[PDB]
């Protein structure tokens, strides 16, 4: 459950990402592929080499989705409807993977927001990414 | 893999009464029904939209047979699961692109199928022994992922 | 998210359990403790030996909560409120453990309801336990 | 440990720049803040009611220093984590009753602290090696559970 304070923390933090969102999303992915190699089984069609065009493109897409999520924090199920559908019926990514990407997103943020990444904001972002993950896998079964 | 001499016996004794064919199709079918996202790998099997559809699919039945056949062979080598499953491990990763989490899910579904079938003979201690085995197998199969 | 079909399935299977609930409860705990020894870290104050009265007692409480949850399938949140409070603020059981107990309940159910434990019911039950689990850890943070 | 020679050195090199004092307290304090259920083991540390109360709690800080000092020692033996942590494993199981899942949570919090602390120097490949190390330490500490 995101409290009013969680929501403020997230908006602040994400406000700071601003224009770098796509660059951070690409970085988070690369961090995921390297640290949790099993996540690569979902991207057999991608060039996972460092700086790959598919990765950069995909990273922008993921980032934009998160940006939207932040913008509609109070209406996530509706905001992310197209993605919930897509993941649930086509992609079919096992739910454990979401926890892996979330961690790599948190690490990325931490490496880039020295001032903002306080323990309270860290807790808010962890909670926010868990909520996004829950929405995206809500139609699996 | 740490199986006490007793656990080993318990595993062996029950397995001798198992009809792989039947059990394999049931384990693979239930997997597909309880955790529908696992259907992502079997598009070519046809319609897997209903439990009845899944459970009666012959492609599902044949695959369940193949899988449990291999499983069955590993029981013969609990001392070297890793070596025994190395090639299948590399195949699942490089060729099939199967998230190793699926191996854990199938292992838990398998245990449910043995309990369903065997009832009261599937005691807590027997389950614990099978729990160690399915984990050992899932681990052996995930071993060569990179 | 439980469909009408799921609720139907659960009411039906739990119905057959009936008076044996408490016995199945204790059986599932036993299966858990032996299959997943780490769960024992939560019952250091218990006699974990076979047929301990404590486990027996505990298993009954657990079955009782489940019965209550099937009765109130449409409003688990309120029906289990005091239990989610206790878990979140007192017991503080790491959420991974819920999955361990849920597996062991399914094992118990399969070993006692051969006729009833069809794929469709299995699926409904898995979903139901997953929901009870979400309710119970809903107030962790 | 299953770290490439390249990975082993990247780990060592970064660790040399770590203030175990400061980092242990940050890492243990952040565990208590992000995953509040973990507070269950520290009722005797006093007030952990708020982020602020947690972060400035001296027992929290002193304990984090102990934890990370032991973590550091294991880094000198990447090859025998099992050996270096056997005693601590028995202690954590038999005496403290700590669910080992907590070791995993702490490992991920530490990764976040290193990233926060080193910024751009904590590159994807460095994190990867550290992910390997924290997993290795959690397993070694879980080893004597029964
Ligand atoms: C924070 C959680 C996630 C978000 C917000 C997210 C978002 C997205 C978006 C925005 C797309 C693109 C849709 C399009 O093509 O128009 C997508 C596709 C995809 N996602 Fe997810 N995703 C998440 C988690 C995951 C995870 C954990 C995995 C697998 C490890 C995954 C695997 C995929 C794949 C394989 C595709 C299709 C890639 C392609 O072929 O272009 N996603 N996701
Ligand atoms: C106990 C765990 C498993 C074992 C021992 C096993 C064994 C096998 C074997 C022996 C084959 C045939 C490979 C060959 O052609 O040499 C195979 C193929 C395959 N397996 Fe696995 N398997 C396991 C689990 C799974 C699971 C859980 C999935 C997906 C959820 C899966 C997906 C596949 C697929 C998609 C194929 C190829 C089927 C085809 O080409 O017809 N396997 N497996
Ligand atoms: C289906 C999920 C669960 C249900 C319905 C459930 C229900 C309950 C109930 C009804 C009580 C007793 C309340 C009272 O007497 O005041 C209880 C207590 C407790 N639960 Fe949960 N529980 C569940 C999962 C778990 C799990 C997975 C664990 C950890 C392995 C756990 C650990 C405990 C402990 C340690 C106690 C206190 C026992 C005592 O000291 O008497 N519970 N639970
Ligand atoms: C990297 C992982 C960890 C390491 C290396 C570690 C190491 C240690 C050491 C060296 C001690 C003191 C041993 C002694 O008394 O001689 C200790 C005590 C303790 N640890 Fe762990 N620890 C780790 C993780 C955790 C976690 C995650 C928790 C709980 C969330 C935990 C809970 C405790 C408790 C409650 C004590 C006893 C403190 C006291 O004396 O009151 N530990 N640990």
For the CA atoms of chain A, what is the radius of gyration? 14
- Compute, in angstroms, the gap from residue B7 CA to the centroid of ligand 2: 27
Is A58 a known ligand-binding residue? yes
With an 8 Å Cβ cutoff, is C20 touching chain B?
A: no
The number of angstroms, rounded, from the C-alpha of B57 to the middle of its chain's C-alpha atoms is 18
CATH class, A1-141 region: mainly alpha
> Considering every ligand atom, which ligand is closest to the CA of A55?
1
Q: Backbone phi, then psi, for B84, in 5-degree steps?
A: -65, -40
A-interface mutation test, from B101, B105, B141, most A Cβ less than 10 A away:
B101
CA angle D74/D79/D80 to nearest 5° reads: 65
CA distance A94 to C83: 29
With an 8 Å Cβ cutoff, is C41 touching chain D?
A: yes
Enter the tokens of residue D60.
């929290």
Reduce the DSSP state of residue B28 to 3 states and report it: helix
Experimental technique: X-ray
Q: Give D86's contacts (C-beta < 8 A, 6+ positions apart).
A: D140, D143, D144
Quick check: B122 and C111 CB within 8 A?
yes
- Asked whether D104 and D138 are in contact (CB, 8 A), the reply is yes
Is any ligand 2 atom within 6 A of the Cβ of residue B38?
yes
The number of angstroms, rounded, from the C-alpha of C106 to the middle of its chain's C-alpha atoms is 9
Closest C-alpha among D73, D72, D58 to residue D28? D58
Is any ligand 4 atom within 6 A of the Cβ of residue D88?
yes
Contacts of B35 in chain A (CB under 8 A): 141
| Half-sphere exposure in the Cβ direction for C129 (13 Å, CA) | 23
Q: Please tell me what resolution, in angstroms, this structure has.
A: 2.0
Q: Give B106's contacts (C-beta < 8 A, 6+ positions apart).
A: B27, B28, B31, B67, B134, B138
With an 8 Å Cβ cutoff, is B12 touching chain C?
A: no
CA distance A86 to B32: 19
Q: Is C15 exposed, middle or buried (0-12, 13-18, 19+ CB in 10 A)?
A: exposed
CA distance B54 to C123: 13
DSSP-assigned letters across all residues of B40-57: GG-GGG---SSHHHHHT-
Enter the tokens of residue C110.
């399969």
CA distance B113 to B131: 13
CA distance C113 to chain B (A): 8
Closest C-alpha among D32, D72, D38, D74 to residue D54? D32
Alpha-carbon separation of residue D116 from A76, B77, C32, D15, D31 (angstroms)? 28, 47, 39, 14, 15
Reduce the DSSP state of residue B69 to 3 states and report it: helix
CA distance D129 to A92: 29
Enter the tokens of residue D106.
């702490």
B72: left (phi over 0), alpha (psi -120 to 50) or beta: alpha
Chains B and D touch (3+ CB pairs under 8 A): no
Is A45 a known ligand-binding residue? no
Alpha-carbon separation of residue A35 from A133, D18, D72, D128, D130 (angstroms)? 19, 21, 21, 4, 9
- Asked whether B64 and B27 are in contact (CB, 8 A), the reply is yes
For the CA atoms of chain C, what is the radius of gyration? 14
Q: Where are the alpha helices (DSSP H) in chain B?
A: 5-15, 20-34, 51-55, 58-74, 81-90, 101-118, 124-142
CA angle D104/D108/D112 to nearest 5° reads: 165
CA distance C121 to C141: 32
Quick check: B131 and C35 CB within 8 A?
yes
- Asked whether C131 and C9 are in contact (CB, 8 A), the reply is no
With an 8 Å Cβ cutoff, is B99 touching chain A?
A: yes
**CA quadruple D16, D19, D25, D31: dihedral, nearest 10:** -40
CA distance B133 to D113: 37
CB atoms inside a 10 Å sphere around CB B87: 10
Reduce the DSSP state of residue A10 to 3 states and report it: helix
Reduce the DSSP state of residue D45 to 3 states and report it: helix
Q: Where are the domains of chain A?
A: 1-141
- Asked whether C118 and C13 are in contact (CB, 8 A), the reply is no
Residue of chain C with shortest Cα separation from B110? C107
Check if CATH label 1.10.490.10 holds for domain B1-146. Answer: yes
- Compute, in angstroms, the gap from residue A111 CA to the centroid of ligand 1: 23
Is any ligand 2 atom within 6 A of the Cβ of residue B135?
no
Quick check: A41 and B39 CB within 8 A?
no
Enter the tokens of residue A132.
């996004």
CA distance B64 to B24: 4
CA distance A26 to B95: 26
D46: left (phi over 0), alpha (psi -120 to 50) or beta: left
Q: Give C69's contacts (C-beta < 8 A, 6+ positions apart).
A: C76, C79, C80, C128, C132, C135
CA distance D131 to D137: 10
CA distance D91 to D93: 5
Buried b (16+ CB within 10 A) or exposed e, A9-43: bbeebbeebeeebbbbbbbbbbbbbbbbebbbbbe
CA distance D136 to D130: 10
- Asked whether C5 and C126 are in contact (CB, 8 A), the reply is no
Q: Where are the alpha helices (DSSP H) in chain C?
A: 4-17, 21-35, 53-71, 76-79, 81-85, 96-112, 119-136
CA distance A125 to A2: 10
The number of angstroms, rounded, from the C-alpha of B10 to the middle of its chain's C-alpha atoms is 18
């Amino acid at each position: 459950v995101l409290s009013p304070a969680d929501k403020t923390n997230v908006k602040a933090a994400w406000g700071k990402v601003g224009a770098h969102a796509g660059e951070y999303g690409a970085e988070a992915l690369e961090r995921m592929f390297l640290s949790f190699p099993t996540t690569k089984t979902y991207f057999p069609h991608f060039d996972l080499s460092h700086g790959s065009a598919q990765v950069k493109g995909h990273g922008k897409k993921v980032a934009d989705a998160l940006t939207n999520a932040v913008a509609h924090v109070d209406d996530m199920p509706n905001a992310l409807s197209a993605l919930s559908d897509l993941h649930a019926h086509k992609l079919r990514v096992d739910p454990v993977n979401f926890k892996l990407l979330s961690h790599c997103l948190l690490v990325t943020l931490a490496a880039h927001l020295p001032a903002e990444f306080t323990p309270a904001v860290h807790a808010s972002l962890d909670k926010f990414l868990a909520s996004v993950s829950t929405v995206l896998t809500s139609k699996y079964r | 893999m740490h199986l006490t001499p007793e656990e080993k016996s318990a595993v062996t004794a029950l397995w001798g009464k198992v009809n792989v064919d039947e059990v394999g199709g049931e384990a693979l079918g239930r997997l597909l029904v309880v955790y529908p996202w696992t259907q992502r790998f079997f598009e070519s099997f046809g319609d897997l939209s209903t439990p009845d559809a899944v459970m009666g699919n012959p492609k599902v039945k044949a695959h369940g047979k193949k899988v449990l056949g291999a499983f069955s062979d590993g029981l013969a080598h609990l001392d070297n699961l890793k070596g025994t499953f190395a090639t299948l491990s590399e195949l699942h990763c490089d060729k099939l692109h199967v998230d190793p989490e699926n191996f854990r899910l199938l292992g838990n579904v398998l245990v449910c199928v043995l309990a369903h079938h065997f009832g009261k003979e599937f005691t807590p201690p027997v389950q614990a022994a099978y729990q160690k085995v399915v984990a050992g197998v899932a681990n052996a199969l995930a071993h060569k992922y990179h």
